Amino acid sequence: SHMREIIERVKEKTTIPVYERTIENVLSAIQASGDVWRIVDLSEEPLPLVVAVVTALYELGYVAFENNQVILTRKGKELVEKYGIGPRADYTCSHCQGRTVEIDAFSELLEQFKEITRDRPEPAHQFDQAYVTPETTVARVALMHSRGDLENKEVFVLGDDDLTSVALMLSGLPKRIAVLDIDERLTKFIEKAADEIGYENIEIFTFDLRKPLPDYALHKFDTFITDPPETVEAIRAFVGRGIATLKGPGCAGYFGITRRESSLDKWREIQRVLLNEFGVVITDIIRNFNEYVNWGYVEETRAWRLLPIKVKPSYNWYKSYMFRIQTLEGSKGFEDEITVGQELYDDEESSTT
Amino acid sequence: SHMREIIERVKEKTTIPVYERTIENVLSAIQASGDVWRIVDLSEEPLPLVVAVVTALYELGYVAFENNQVILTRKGKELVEKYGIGPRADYTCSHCQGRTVEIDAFSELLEQFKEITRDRPEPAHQFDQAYVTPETTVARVALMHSRGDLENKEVFVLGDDDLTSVALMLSGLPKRIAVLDIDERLTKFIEKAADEIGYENIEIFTFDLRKPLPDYALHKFDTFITDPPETVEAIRAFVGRGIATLKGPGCAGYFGITRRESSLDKWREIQRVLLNEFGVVITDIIRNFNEYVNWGYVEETRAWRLLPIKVKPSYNWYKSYMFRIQTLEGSKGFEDEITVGQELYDDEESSTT
Numbered sequence: 001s002h003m004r005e006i007i008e009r010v011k012e013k014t015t016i017p018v019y020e021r022t023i024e025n026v027l028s029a030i031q032a033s034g035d036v037w038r039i040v041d042l043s044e045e046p047l048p049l050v051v052a053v054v055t056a057l058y059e060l061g062y063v064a065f066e067n068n069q070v071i072l073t074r075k076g077k078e079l080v081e082k083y084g085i086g087p088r089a090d091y092t093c094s095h096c097q098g099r100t101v102e103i104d105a106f107s108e109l110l111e112q113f114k115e116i117t118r119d120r121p122e123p124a125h126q127f128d129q130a131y132v133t134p135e136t137t138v139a140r141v142a143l144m145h146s147r148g149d150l151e152n153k154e155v156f157v158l159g160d161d162d163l164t165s166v167a168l169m170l171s172g173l174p175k176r177i178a179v180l181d182i183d184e185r186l187t188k189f190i191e192k193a194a195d196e197i198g199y200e201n202i203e204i205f206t207f208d209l210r211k212p213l214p215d216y217a218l219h220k221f222d223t224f225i226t227d228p229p230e231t232v233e234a235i236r237a238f239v240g241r242g243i244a245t246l247k248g249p250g251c252a253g254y255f256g257i258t259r260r261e262s263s264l265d266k267w268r269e270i271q272r273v274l275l276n277e278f279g280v281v282i283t284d285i286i287r288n289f290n291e292y293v294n295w296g297y298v299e300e301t302r303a304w305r306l307l308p309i310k311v312k313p314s315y316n317w318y319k320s321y322m323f324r325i326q327t328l329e330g331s332k333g334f335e336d337e338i339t340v341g342q343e344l345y346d347d348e349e350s351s352t353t
Numbered sequence: 354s355h356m357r358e359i360i361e362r363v364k365e366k367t368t369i370p371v372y373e374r375t376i377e378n379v380l381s382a383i384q385a386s387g388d389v390w391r392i393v394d395l396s397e398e399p400l401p402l403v404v405a406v407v408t409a410l411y412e413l414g415y416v417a418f419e420n421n422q423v424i425l426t427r428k429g430k431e432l433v434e435k436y437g438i439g440p441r442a443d444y445t446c447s448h449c450q451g452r453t454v455e456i457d458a459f460s461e462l463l464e465q466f467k468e469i470t471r472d473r474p475e476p477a478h479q480f481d482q483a484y485v486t487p488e489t490t491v492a493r494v495a496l497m498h499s500r501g502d503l504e505n506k507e508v509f510v511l512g513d514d515d516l517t518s519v520a521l522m523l524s525g526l527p528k529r530i531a532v533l534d535i536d537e538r539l540t541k542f543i544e545k546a547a548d549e550i551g552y553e554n555i556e557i558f559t560f561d562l563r564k565p566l567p568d569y570a571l572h573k574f575d576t577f578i579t580d581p582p583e584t585v586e587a588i589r590a591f592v593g594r595g596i597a598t599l600k601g602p603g604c605a606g607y608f609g610i611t612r613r614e615s616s617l618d619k620w621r622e623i624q625r626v627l628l629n630e631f632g633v634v635i636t637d638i639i640r641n642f643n644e645y646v647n648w649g650y651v652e653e654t655r656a657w658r659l660l661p662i663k664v665k666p667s668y669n670w671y672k673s674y675m676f677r678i679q680t681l682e683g684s685k686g687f688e689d690e691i692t693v694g695q696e697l698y699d700d701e702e703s704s705t706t
């Protein structure tokens with residue numbers, strides 16, 4: 001049948017797992033939008049897999065490109081009618097953007113945050129950077145505070161291009177803040193921000209999470225936040241080490257996981273690492289909580305090379321799910337060394353480096 | 354000294370795991386509200402554990418019961434001051450109630466649902482029943498439809514005091530519906546509802562999920578929904594069997610899991626069952642998505658016997674998180690017979706039976 005031929009054609013182009021649902025998700029997204037960035041967004045499939053599906057549909061005559069937009073052909077409209085694939089409806093809450101939390105009480109914080117981060121360091125390609133919107137950062141504080149994880153708590157920030165530590169300083173909630181980053185620009189900027197605010201209880205240092213954390217970072221914190229790369233190795237280096245910073249049971253962890261650069265097959269492996277290797281429980285998984293500001297190095301990335309139509313994104317297409325985890329009896333972090341180079345950031349499903 | 358004495362006293366009263374965070378969660382909730390049901394709600398700890406913590410604090414002189422409110426004593430205010438335990442903040446979106454989806458576009462469906470469910474069967478004690486609000490039922494449809502899991506899909510409903518199958522019939526989205534329940538009253542009510550709507554593509558049958566599902570249920574459906582009891586046996590009998598109804602990879606499952614009757618230790622156990630035994634991925638975990646209507650048999654339950662302040666709830670205190678799961682390569686369900694009595698519903702963490 002029609003669908004077997006499509007799936008077979010997609011498997012020729014990628015090693016990323018392909019199911020009938022993969023094809024449905026892309027076809028549903030195409031009926032909603034012709035923008036290739038938005039098709040990745042609305043399908044919730046990883047970009048390289050979406051490209052393979054779009055290329056397969058293009059080759060078999062189910063889609064055409066017109067004005068740099070992917071549209072269903074006559075044969076494409078027959079296919080979606082035959083298989084009952086409608087356009088993907090969206091009922092995301094317009095007030096909270098689907099975040100579950102409203103930031104009406106943090107209007108002063110948002111205002112202060114925007115002004116102090118006016119000249120924030122722009123995203124570096126080498127360190128897989130892309131900062132979230134000011135509204136996302138404030139929503140993170142609201143979320144973390146609503147779960148009782150900030151007020152009088154010792155908070156660890158593993159990597160901080162998002163400048164969550166700056167928002168945490170302005171909130172006045174933590175007892176103390178620890179923040180690290182491989183990028184010198186961010187540690188200097190956060191130090192400058194702390195000096196301007198007059199914030200005493202912050203420890204800032206440069207560090208490569210390829211190395212094991214020193215003793216002063218281990219077993220001494222109540223909450224951690226990180227927004228990591230999505231190789232399984234990077235999950236251990238960022239989230240795993242984040243769990244190692246926590247004192248013991250009853251401590252929290254916050255991090256983003258995309259559908260843009262991780263398939264649901266990798267989600268299963270990531271969740272198995274969390275539940276089996278680190279013994280933590282996942283308390284929340286919130287769709288598109290984090291909205292990322294578009295990054296200037298887009299044209300130098302794998303995504304730009306892969307895409308059949310190459311136009312700079314016109315909106316914030318890239319989003320991630322917010323994970324919350326909590327430690328229990330028998331939880332543990334990651335304390336071993338990692339020696340990979342670019343494979344920390346890059347795998348078959350990644351495209352934004 | 355202070356906290357260890359409390360933790361030791363709680364461990365004498367229950368075998369449910371107790372951490373310092375358990376005590377913090379309850380004390381934070383006490384500061385926000387004196388209502389015992391609201392303390393269970395805001396603490397997000399299971400009811401019997403909350404009872405043990407409250408009774409321990411009461412005996413050690415930290416709380417008192419005044420006008421049927423759990424209030425902090427002068428010693429209690431010193432305790433929360435000493436450990437830096439603030440009152441639990443909450444920034445839950447007032448438009449969607451934290452559900453992530455709004456039901457503005459389903460106002461007609463809500464009106465139709467309320468009309469046809471005026472004389473719905475009231476919740477029976479023996480089958481652990483309590484139906485969600487009509488707003489919740491419509492929100493479920495919006496959520497499931499937004500992820501592409503209803504339109505032209507074959508949907509299985511394992512247990513339906515919530516009457517999700519009636520809402521699904523009214524929506525006109527499914528290709529067909531299959532629904533089962535142990536309660537004859539509900540199967541007959543859905544029958545009468547189906548004949549009243551003139552809905553042809555629904556199969557209704559009475560069934561005990563202790564038994565393995567028959568041939569015609571297995572591997573023929575795209576989506577399932579269930580709202581199960583929270584013993585590990587019940588998760589296998591409801592959610593596991595739900596997974597067994599799904600055709601293969603790329604199929605969806607929806608279910609509620611409470612913090613009211615399951616500790617986070619049991620959440621880790623349940624998540625391990627989902628990821629390791631069934632091999633499914635968890636795509637969403639949304640806090641307090643399901644709001645339950647208070648049930649008339651409350652005074653006959655374990656909760657009433659445990660509560661140190663015996664007053665009926667004044668609001669819908671009982672809520673559950675919405676889980677979404679998806680099947681992948683190598684996912685499988687549960688197909689064995691279970692031989693248990695009341696232990697299907699009851700364990701040490703349960704209290705609403």
Ligand SMILES: CSC[C@H]1O[C@@H](n2cnc3c(N)ncnc32)[C@H](O)[C@@H]1O
Nearest residue numbers: 127128159160161182183208209229
């Ligand atoms: C992955 S992007 C999130 C943050 O992590 C930082 N980061 C990237 N790689 C590393 C690393 N190996 N060690 C520490 N921080 C890193 C980036 O500079 C950014 O601020």
Ligand SMILES: CSC[C@H]1O[C@@H](n2cnc3c(N)ncnc32)[C@H](O)[C@@H]1O
Nearest residue numbers: 480481512513514535536561562582
């Ligand atoms: C657990 S409450 C959710 C729904 O499941 C139903 N239910 C409870 N126990 C069983 C069982 N053993 N088999 C099938 N359905 C059940 C109830 O009647 C209710 O409608």
Ligand SMILES: [Fe+3]
Nearest residue numbers: 093096446449
């Ligand atoms: Fe909302």
